Amino acid sequence: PIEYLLFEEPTGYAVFKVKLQQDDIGSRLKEVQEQINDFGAFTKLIELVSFAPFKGAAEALENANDISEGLVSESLKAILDLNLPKASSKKKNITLAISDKNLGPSIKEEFPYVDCISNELAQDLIRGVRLHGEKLFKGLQSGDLERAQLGLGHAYSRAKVKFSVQKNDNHIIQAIALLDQLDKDINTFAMRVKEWYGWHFPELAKLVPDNYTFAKLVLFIKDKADDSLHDLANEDSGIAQRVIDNARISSETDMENVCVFAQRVASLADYRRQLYDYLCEKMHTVAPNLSELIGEVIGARLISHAGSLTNLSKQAASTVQILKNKGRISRYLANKCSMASRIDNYSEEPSNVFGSVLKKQVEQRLEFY
Amino acid sequence: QVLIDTNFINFSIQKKVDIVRGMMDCLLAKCNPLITDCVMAELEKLGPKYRIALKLARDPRIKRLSCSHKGTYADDCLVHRVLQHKCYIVATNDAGLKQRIRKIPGIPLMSVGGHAYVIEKLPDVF
Amino acid sequence: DDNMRREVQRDLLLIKHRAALDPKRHYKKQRWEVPERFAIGTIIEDKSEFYSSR
């Protein structure tokens, strides 16, 4: 007698009622072993009486950990106390079929009138309801069971390994791989801005060569002016007002358009150095020893070209591409930097002190020469 | 480890050789003798004349394998499981099985000859 | 299509007659007729190791 069946699953708990017992003595035979594959005969054995779904992925992860380490959770207590009849504790307990021989003791600790069975009969009843799944439940659950399985497997694994998204080096991979892209984008866009303003006067790109400073000053100068007080951010500003007096190049709609283009260049220019500050901060919280040793942008490009903090860590020290005496300080800094990246990757929440010591060692080595 | 068959057991009892002690002083090594379920089926099918042979094959020192096929043809089972794996000595006295086993290479063959066991295709016996 | 088979029709002949390109290479005996669906692709050696397969 195997009277009830408890199937745990990511969407919730299910209590089934066993209608017909399968054979005990003929349980290894061919027809008994493939009646759990045929669905038309498995539905003669198993009937669903209850399904308590979870409150969400949080309670799903809680009950996944409790089922994993063999404990009865509160939702288990609720559904078992709803479904199982108040049998005696000394004479003919009610029989629940589980799949976990160390979850059984936790069930009898809470309900002493329940004896729990997980032997081969309960095992193949359980794998019958696992094999059929969504067909037994008659349509009563929200959410596809495999989609909840993907979510619960990823959540369980990240919990079990303590996956932190603060010390997640893919952020600094994508940050520096995007920062190089917008380096060349601000470069080519301000080159075209300088080209389109080159026939308004071709000396602003001679006095003010930096792309952002040129673009922000030409975003507000559109004419002659004189009144050269708020154009110092003043020898270069005085020379620029002198050149505006001696203007020596040649609209309205085109000039409005190149104003929109220079505003685009300014927006790219202050999204860069927001990103740079972000990745220096993320590099201090992800790789503090590397950034103490060779700097945040250099360590960022180092772990980008390595592919991950783990790949830079597990790489050999003689095979690190960092960027005579000048020839062998590269090798010294390489193997100290590999050491620092190993410290920084495999320590769990790192300090800065070993990056400090290795910086002291490499400055002692370079000052020795 | 040595796979026995039925005429090897019958010739062992007819020549008064113990199985594990005859194997040990033939090879000068520690032997594990194996009765497959088809060899055991053949000894049981031999009838009540061979009760002595059947309950000498029932011996805790003789371990026993579990063949998974239909029928009880021990020569087919021994040939298949020896040419699959080449980690077996075949102890037999059937002329046909002796010819099969000594035609497949790398398989030593043991047989009751005289008053003790002999071994042929094992090149390290002394 | 035949329009692309008429562009890669020569190196498929080279792969068919691999065995007589180098006098020291000596492949194992297959026939290798031209497969019905193929694709011509270029090896990306990455930016990790230099100078060896580069």
Binding site: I25, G104 | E44, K45 | -
Partner: protein, 286 residues
């Protein structure tokens, strides 16, 4: 799984009887959800009681064998346990009654000084014993009166008895002229059936738990299943490998038949040969 929980070198001679118990100790409490109990008598003058670790419930988590050793002065030949109240009975040179607490027989219940070859307790009206003695005798005992009740002498020797589990006063004897006899306890002057189709001495008999058919293994190396109202064999099971079937039981499913032969093997059979054990849809069941 067709595999032994445990084996036991129990005695030195033949283990001549064994049965199973739920031992009602009045100091300990029997743990029947994780231990099974079998006791067994042999010709080396011992009855031994063993416990078995059983994986059938997963409630718990253990000192398996030989919890006690009853001791007689002469050999034993049969044993059967009462289905309550800690009691069993052993036949041998004389038939004794025992309980699992005391290390000595409670009572000797022997008709005369003629030995006893077999024993069965009743299954309902559990206090009625029956026994086969080697003077071709079948004796009934009652345990209210703590005494024998009535015996009959037949032509040849009764090898075994089994009581009808559904009729409580009928039993079947299996004896050495090659047939079985269905007897009423209230009138032993006539058998109420004879099951005839064996050709050598019938070694063991057993009832279906439905009480509707019997199984009957004999010294010709074959077993036979009989409908209880007919008197000839409904079915014969044989095998070239099976020799001299000495023990037959009818499993509590009423669907399989366990036979123990004397080459060593214990074999399962279907009681209905053409019947498969899958669950059936209503079209194939109809």
């Amino acid at each position: 799984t067709r595999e032994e929980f445990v084996s036991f070198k129990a005695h030195y001679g033949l283990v001549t009887g064994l049965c199973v118990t739920q031992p009602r100790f009045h100091d300990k409490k029997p743990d029947l959800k994780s231990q099974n109990f079998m006791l067994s008598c042999s010709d080396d003058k011992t009855v031994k009681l063993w416990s078995i670790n059983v994986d059938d419930y997963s409630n718990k988590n253990n000192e398996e064998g030989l919890i006690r050793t009853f001791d007689g002065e002469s050999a034993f030949q049969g044993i059967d346990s009462h289905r309550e109240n800690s009691t069993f009975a052993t036949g041998g040179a004389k038939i004794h009654l025992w309980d699992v607490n005391r290390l000595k027989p409670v009572s000797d219940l022997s008709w005369g000084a003629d030995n006893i070859t077999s024993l069965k307790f009743n299954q309902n009206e559990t206090d009625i014993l029956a026994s086969t003695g080697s003077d071709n005798s079948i004796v009934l005992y009652d345990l209210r009166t703590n005494s024998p009740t009535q015996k009959i002498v037949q032509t040849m020797r009764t090898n075994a008895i089994c009581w009808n589990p559904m009729e409580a006063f009928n039993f079947v004897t299996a004896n050495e002229d090659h047939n079985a006899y269905y007897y009423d306890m209230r009138n032993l002057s006539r058998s109420l059936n004879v099951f005839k189709d064996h050709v050598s001495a019938v070694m063991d008999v057993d009832f279906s738990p439905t009480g509707d058919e019997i199984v009957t293994g004999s010294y010709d190396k074959s077993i036979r299943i009989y409908k209880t109202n007919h008197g000839h064999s409904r079915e014969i099971y044989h095998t070239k490998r099976m020799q001299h079937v000495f023990q037959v039981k009818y499993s509590m499913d009423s669907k399989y038949i366990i036979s123990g032969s004397d080459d060593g093997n214990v074999r399962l059979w279907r009681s209905k040969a053409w019947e498969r054990s899958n669950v059936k849809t209503t079209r194939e069941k109809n």
